[PDB]
Amino acid sequence: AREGGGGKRKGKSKKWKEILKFPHISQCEDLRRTIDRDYCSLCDKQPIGRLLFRQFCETRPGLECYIQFLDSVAEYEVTPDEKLGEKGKKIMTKYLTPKSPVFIAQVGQDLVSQTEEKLLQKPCKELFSACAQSVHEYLRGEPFHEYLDSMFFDRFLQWKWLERQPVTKNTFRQYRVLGKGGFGEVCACQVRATGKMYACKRLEKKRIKKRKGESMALNEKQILEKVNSQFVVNLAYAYETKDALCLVLTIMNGGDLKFHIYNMGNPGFEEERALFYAAEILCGLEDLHHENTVYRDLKPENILLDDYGHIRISDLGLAVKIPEGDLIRGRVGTVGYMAPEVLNNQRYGLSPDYWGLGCLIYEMIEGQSPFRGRKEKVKREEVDRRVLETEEVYSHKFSEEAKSICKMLLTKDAKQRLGCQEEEAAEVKRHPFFRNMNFKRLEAGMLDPPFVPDPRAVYCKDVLDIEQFSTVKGVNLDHTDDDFYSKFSTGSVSIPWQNEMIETECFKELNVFGPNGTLPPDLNRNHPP
Ligand SMILES: Nc1ncnc2c1ncn2[C@@H]1O[C@H](COP(=O)(O)OP(=O)(O)NP(=O)(O)O)[C@@H](O)[C@H]1O
Numbered sequence: 009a010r011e012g013g014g015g016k017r018k019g020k021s022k023k024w025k026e027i028l029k030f031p032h033i034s035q036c037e038d039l040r041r042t043i044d045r046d047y048c049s050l051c052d053k054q055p056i057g058r059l060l061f062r063q064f065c066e067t068r069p070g071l072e073c074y075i076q077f078l079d080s081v082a083e084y085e086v087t088p089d090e091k092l093g094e095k096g097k098k099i100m101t102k103y104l105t106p107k108s109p110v111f112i113a114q115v116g117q118d119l120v121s122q123t124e125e126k127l128l129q130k131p132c133k134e135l136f137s138a139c140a141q142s143v144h145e146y147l148r149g150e151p152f153h154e155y156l157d158s159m160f161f162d163r164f165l166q167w168k169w170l171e172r173q174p175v176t177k178n179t180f181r182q183y184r185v186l187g188k189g190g191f192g193e194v195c196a197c198q199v200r201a202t203g204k205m206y207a208c209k210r211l212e213k214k215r216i217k218k219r220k221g222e223s224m225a226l227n228e229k230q231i232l233e234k235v236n237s238q239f240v241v242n243l244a245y246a247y248e249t250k251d252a253l254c255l256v257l258t259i260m261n262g263g264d265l266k267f268h269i270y271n272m273g274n275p276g277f278e279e280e281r282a283l284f285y286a287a288e289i290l291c292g293l294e295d296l297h298h299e300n301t302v303y304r305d306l307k308p309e310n311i312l313l314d315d316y317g318h319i320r321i322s323d324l325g326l327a328v329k330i331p332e333g334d335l336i337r338g339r340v341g342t343v344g345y346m347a348p349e350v351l352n353n354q355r356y357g358l359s360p361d362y363w364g365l366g367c368l369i370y371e372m373i374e375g376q377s378p379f380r381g382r383k384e385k386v387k388r389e390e391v392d393r394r395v396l397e398t399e400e401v402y403s404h405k406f407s408e409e410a411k412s413i414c415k416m417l418l419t420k421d422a423k424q425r426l427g428c429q430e431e432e433a434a435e436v437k438r439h440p441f442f443r444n445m446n447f448k449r450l451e452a453g454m455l456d457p458p459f460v461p462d463p464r465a466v467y468c469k470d471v472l473d474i475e476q477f478s479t480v481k482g483v484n485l486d487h488t489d490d491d492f493y494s495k496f497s498t499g500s501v502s503i504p505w506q507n508e509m510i511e512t513e514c515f516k517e518l519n520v521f522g523p524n525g526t527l528p529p530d531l532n533r534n535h536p537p
C-alpha cells in the first residue's frame with residue numbers, strides 16, 4: 009500500500025489484471041515439485057510468502073496467538089526507551105503468563121524466566137529476541153507443514169509462477185535520463201503492469217569489455233540481489249539488451265550526497281542533517297555487515313537521496329562478501345577515502361567501512377574531505393601520505409560530539425577504531441553524537457528527515473534502448489562474454505518483486521479467494537483450463 013514517485017505519470021496498465029492473471033493451480037506442479045520447502049525463506053524472508061503464511065495462521069486461533077506475539081514484539085522494539093518496562097510487562101502478562109487466554113505455551117518457561125529477569129533490570133530493545141526465535145522454532149514445525157498443505161501455499165505457488173515469468177520487451181516503459189557515467193547511463197523506467205517506478209542502470213557491453221569489468225559488474229549484481237536493506241539500493245530485475253546489460257534499481261532521484269554537501273555554496277550543512285544521514289548510512293552498513301560484506305567504497309557520490317530525503321548506499325561494485333572467519337586483501341577504493349589498513353595493503357575485515365563513515369561525517373559537516381581540498385592539485389601518493397601520517401583538524405563547524413565521533417572513526421589503527429570492536433555497530437550507535445537517535449525507529453521509518461530535496465533534473469536528450477533482448481549466444485568459439493551475459497540476466501529478483509506487488513496493491517487486489525466455500529476457480533482442481 010506504500011508508494012512514492014519517480015514521477016509516475018502513468019499508473020497501472022488498464023489490463024494489469026490480465027498481465028498478472030494467476031495460472032490455474034494445475035500449471036504449478038513443476039513449481040510444487042522443485043521448490044525448497046524452507047520455513048525461513050517461504051514464511052518470513054519472502055514478503056508474499058510471509059503474508060500468506062500469516063493469512064493461514066489467522067484461520068487458526070491456536071496459531072494466531074503466535075503471530076500476535078511476534079507483532080507485539082515488533083511494537084516493543086520501537087517503543088521509547090523510557091516506556092520499555094511497561095510495554096515489556098504488558099507482553100509478559102498477555103503472552104507469557106499461562107493465566108492469559110492468548111498465552112503461548114511453546115515458549116519454554118526457562119526462556120520466560122530469563123526474560124522476566126532481564127525485564128526487572130534495565131530493559132533493552134532486544135529483550136524478546138530469544139522468545140521470538142523460540143516461536144519460529146515452533147512455527148517451522150507442524151504449523152509450517154500444515155501451511156504447505158493449504159490453499160494459502162497453493163496461492164503462494166501461483167504468485168511464484170508470476171514472479172518467475174520472463175522479463176520481455178513489454179515489461180517496462182522508459183522515462184527520462186536520470187544520470188550518466190560509469191559504464192553507461194541511468195534512466196527512469198516503470199513496470200507497465202504495476203506502475204512502479206525504478207532506475208534502470210544501463211551498462212554498455214562494449215564498455216564493460218574494454219575495461220574488463222565483467223567480474224565487477226557481476227559482483228555488484230550478486231551482492232545487490234542478496235542484500236535487502238532499506239538503506240541500500242535494491243535490485244528488482246536484471247536483464248539483457250542487444251548492446252547492454254540492465255540493472256533495475258531503487259529509484260533514488262533526490263541527488264547524491266556530493267551534490268548536497270557542495271550545493272550550499274557554503275559547503276557542509278547543519279549537524280542535524282549530517283546526524284540523520286550518518287545514522288541511516290550506519291544502518292546500511294550494519295545490513296551489509298550482517299552478510300559479512302564489506303562495502304569498501306564509502307564517499308559522498310555513492311550515497312543517494314530519494315524524494316523523501318532518506319538515503320541509500322549505492323554502487324556496490326567494490327563490495328566483497330568475506331568468507332566467515334576470514335580476512336581479505338586488496339587495495340581498492342577512491343583516493344582520499346581509503347582506510348590506512350587498505351592503503352598499507354594489509355589483511356582486513358569490515359573495518360574500512362567505519363573509516364569511511366568517519367570520512368563522510370567529517371565531509372558533511374566541514375564541507376571538505378579530511379585529507380584533501382576540493383580545489384587542490386595534489387598527487388594521489390601525497391593524499392595517501394596525509395592519510396597515513398597526518399591528523400585531520402576540526403573547525404568551529406564541529407560540535408564536541410561530532411569532533412569526537414569523527415576522531416574515533418578516523419582512528420588510523422583499525423584495532424582501536426570505533427565500531428571495530430566486539431560490539432560492532434552497537435558501539436557507534438551509543439556514541440553521544442547519536443544520543444538523541446532511536447535507531448529502531450529510524451530502521452522502521454518512523455523518523456522524518458530534516459531536509460527534503462528538490463528532485464534531480466538533468467538535461468539529456470539521449471534516450472538509449474532498454475528493451476529486453478536475449479542475444480543469440482555462442483556465435484564465436486570464445487563465448488566468455490556470452491557466458492557472462494547469461495549469468496547476469498536472471499530476470500526478476502524475488503524479494504523486491506514481491507515488495508513491488510505489495511506496495512502497488514497488486515497483491516491486495518489480486519489476492520482473493522472464494523466467498524464462503526472459499527476456493528476460487530483458479531484454485532479449483534475440478535475445472536482446469
Ligand atoms: N538508483 C539510482 N537512482 C537514480 N539515479 C541514480 C541511481 N544510481 C545512480 N544514479 C545516478 O546516475 C549517474 C551515474 O551513476 P554511475 O553509473 O554509478 O556512474 P558514476 O557515479 O558517474 N561514476 P562511478 O564512479 O564509476 O560510479 C550518477 O549521477 C548517479 O547519481
Ligand SMILES: [Mg+2]
Binds near residue numbers: 189190309310323
Ligand atoms: Mg557511481
